[PDB]
Structure 1
Amino acid sequence: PKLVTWMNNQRVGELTKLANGAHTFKYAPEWLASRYARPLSLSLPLQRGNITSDAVFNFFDNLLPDSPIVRDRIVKRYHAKSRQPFDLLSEIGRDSVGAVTLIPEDETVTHPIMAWEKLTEARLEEVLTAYKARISVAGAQEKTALLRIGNDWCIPKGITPTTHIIKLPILSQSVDNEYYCLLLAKELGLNVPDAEIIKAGNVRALAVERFDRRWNAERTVLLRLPQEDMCQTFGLPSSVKYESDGGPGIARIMAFLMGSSEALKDRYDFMKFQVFQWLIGATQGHAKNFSVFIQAGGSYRLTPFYDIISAFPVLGGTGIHISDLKLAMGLNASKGKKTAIDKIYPRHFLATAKVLRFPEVQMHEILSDFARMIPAALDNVKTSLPTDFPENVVTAVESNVLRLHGRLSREY
Structure 2
Amino acid sequence: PKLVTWMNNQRVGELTKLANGAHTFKYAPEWLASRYARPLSLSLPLQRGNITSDAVFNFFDNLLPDSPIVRDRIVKRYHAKSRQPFDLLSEIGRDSVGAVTLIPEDETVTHPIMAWEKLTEARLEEVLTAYKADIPLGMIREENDFRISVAGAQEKTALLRIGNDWCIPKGITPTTHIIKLPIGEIRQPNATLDLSQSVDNEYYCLLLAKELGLNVPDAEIIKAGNVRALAVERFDRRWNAERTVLLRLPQEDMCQTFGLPSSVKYESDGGPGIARIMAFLMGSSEALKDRYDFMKFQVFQWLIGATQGHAKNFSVFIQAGGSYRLTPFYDIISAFPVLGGTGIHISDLKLAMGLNASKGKKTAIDKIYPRHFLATAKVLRFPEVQMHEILSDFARMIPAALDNVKTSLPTDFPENVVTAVESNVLRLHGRLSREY
Shorter-chain TM-score: which interval? over 0.9
Distance across 1 between alignment mates of 2:132 and 2:320:
40
Displacement, 1:235?
1.1
SS at match of 1:255: helix
Displacement, 1:361?
0.8
Displacement, 1:129?
1.7
Structure-2 residue corresponding to 1:138: 151
Displacement, 1:165?
0.3
Distance of aligned partners of 1:378 and 1:172 in 2 relative to their CA distance in 1, 3 Å threshold:
closer
Question: 1:214–1:222: 8 Å Cα contact kept in structure 2?
Answer: yes
SS at match of 1:330: strand
Give the structure-2-normalised TM-score: 0.92
Displacement, 1:52?
4.1
More deviation, 10-19/281-290? 10-19
Displacement, 1:115?
2.4
Distance of aligned partners of 1:52 and 1:300 in 2 relative to their CA distance in 1, 3 Å threshold:
same
- CA RMSD, Structure 1 to Structure 2 (Å): 1.3
SS at match of 2:217: coil
> Which deviations, in whole Å up to 9, do the C-alpha atoms of 1:182-234 show, x marking residues without a partner?
01101112111120011121121111110110122111111011100110112
Question: 2:11–2:28: 8 Å Cα contact kept in structure 1?
Answer: yes
Structure-1 residue corresponding to 2:142: none
Distance across 2 between alignment mates of 1:304 and 1:140:
20
Gapped regions of structure 1 (runs ≥ 5): none
SS at match of 1:338: strand
> Which deviations, in whole Å up to 9, do the C-alpha atoms of 1:280-309 show, x marking residues without a partner?
111110101101001111011110001110
Which protein has the bigger strand share?
2
> Which deviations, in whole Å up to 9, do the C-alpha atoms of 1:149-171 show, x marking residues without a partner?
222212211210011000101x2
Displacement, 1:370?
1.2
More deviation, 20-29/386-395? 20-29
SS at match of 2:16: coil
Total equivalences in the alignment: 411
Question: 1:181–1:309: 8 Å Cα contact kept in structure 2?
Answer: yes
Question: 1:110–1:159: 8 Å Cα contact kept in structure 2?
Answer: no
Instruction: Give the 5 Å matches for 1:333-352.
Output: 333-352=357-376
Distance of aligned partners of 1:313 and 1:240 in 2 relative to their CA distance in 1, 3 Å threshold:
same
Distance of aligned partners of 1:319 and 1:351 in 2 relative to their CA distance in 1, 3 Å threshold:
same
Question: 2:63–2:150: 8 Å Cα contact kept in structure 1?
Answer: no
Distance across 2 between alignment mates of 1:206 and 1:309:
13
Identity among equivalent positions (%) equals 100
Question: 2:37–2:321: 8 Å Cα contact kept in structure 1?
Answer: yes
Match status 1:157 vs 2:170: yes
Question: 1:346–1:407: 8 Å Cα contact kept in structure 2?
Answer: yes
Question: 2:209–2:216: 8 Å Cα contact kept in structure 1?
Answer: yes
Structure-2 residue corresponding to 1:256: 280
> Which deviations, in whole Å up to 9, do the C-alpha atoms of 1:40-67 show, x marking residues without a partner?
0100011111224221111121111122
More deviation, 11-20/40-49? 11-20
Displacement, 1:132?
4.5
Distance of aligned partners of 1:140 and 1:379 in 2 relative to their CA distance in 1, 3 Å threshold:
farther
Question: 2:8–2:99: 8 Å Cα contact kept in structure 1?
Answer: yes
Question: 1:164–1:207: 8 Å Cα contact kept in structure 2?
Answer: yes
Match status 1:147 vs 2:160: yes
Question: 2:154–2:181: 8 Å Cα contact kept in structure 1?
Answer: no
More deviation, 109-118/197-206? 109-118
Structure-1 residue corresponding to 2:223: 199
Distance of aligned partners of 1:52 and 1:128 in 2 relative to their CA distance in 1, 3 Å threshold:
closer
Instruction: Give the 5 Å matches for 1:13-412.
Output: 13-132=13-132, 134-169=147-182, 171-412=195-436
Displacement, 1:22?
3.7
> Which deviations, in whole Å up to 9, do the C-alpha atoms of 1:127-159 show, x marking residues without a partner?
212224611123242211112222221221121
Distance across 1 between alignment mates of 2:165 and 2:6:
31
Question: 1:140–1:307: 8 Å Cα contact kept in structure 2?
Answer: no
Distance across 1 between alignment mates of 2:257 and 2:12:
19
SS at match of 1:244: helix
Question: 2:196–2:417: 8 Å Cα contact kept in structure 1?
Answer: no
Displacement, 1:395?
1.1
Displacement, 1:98?
0.5
Distance across 2 between alignment mates of 1:247 and 1:227:
20
SS at match of 1:232: coil
Runs (4 or more) in structure 1 with deviation over 4 Å come to none
Displacement, 1:175?
0.6
Question: 2:22–2:52: 8 Å Cα contact kept in structure 1?
Answer: no
Question: 1:74–1:83: 8 Å Cα contact kept in structure 2?
Answer: no
Distance across 2 between alignment mates of 1:173 and 1:288:
22
Displacement, 1:391?
0.7
SS at match of 1:89: helix
Displacement, 1:107?
1.9
> Which deviations, in whole Å up to 9, do the C-alpha atoms of 1:64-114 show, x marking residues without a partner?
112222222122111111111221011212112101111222122133322
